[PDB]
Amino acid sequence: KRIHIVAGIIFNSDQSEIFITKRPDHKGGFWEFPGGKVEAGESREQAMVRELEEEIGITVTEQQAFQHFDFDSLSFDFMLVTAFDGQPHGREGQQGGWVKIADLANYRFPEANDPVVKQVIAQF
Numbered sequence: 001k002r003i004h005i006v007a008g009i010i011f012n013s014d015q016s017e018i019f020i021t022k023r024p025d026h027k028g029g030f031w032e033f034p035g036g037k038v039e040a041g042e043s044r045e046q047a048m049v050r051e052l053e054e055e056i057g058i059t060v061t062e063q064q065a066f067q068h069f070d071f072d073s074l075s076f077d078f079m080l081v082t083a084f085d086g087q088p089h090g091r092e093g094q095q096g097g098w099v100k101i102a103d104l105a106n107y108r109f110p111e112a113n114d115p116v117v118k119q120v121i122a123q124f
Helices: 044-056 101-106 111-122
Strands: 003-011 017-022 035-037 059-071 074-085 095-100
Touching: 003 044, 003 059, 003 111, 017 044, 017 101, 035 044, 044 059, 044 074, 059 111, 095 101, 101 111
Parallel strands: 003 074
Antiparallel strands: 003 017, 003 035, 017 095, 059 074
């Protein structure tokens, strides 16, 4: 049985910074691209837009698939979020950082996100 995860690289207007979040150490301890599970009556894109509402307070208006990752069954779709309304905040009690792309390397991410962290960095 499958589960499907969407997650977001939330970009500022210059695309020099991304918004990144850390959950109350529920059970690990790491920063992550905000997201959640896609529900049975919605598309990926739909789920991500909704999730960034719940998670972070923004209304997504522009996004684009960035990278997909599969694991043995577990489906991960990362998108680019380039325009939104609202300004993002930790709406669910999490830590939120606006972090210079330069500096992204500086933070601890679960291994799942590492290739995405590096792709963001490579795509300056």
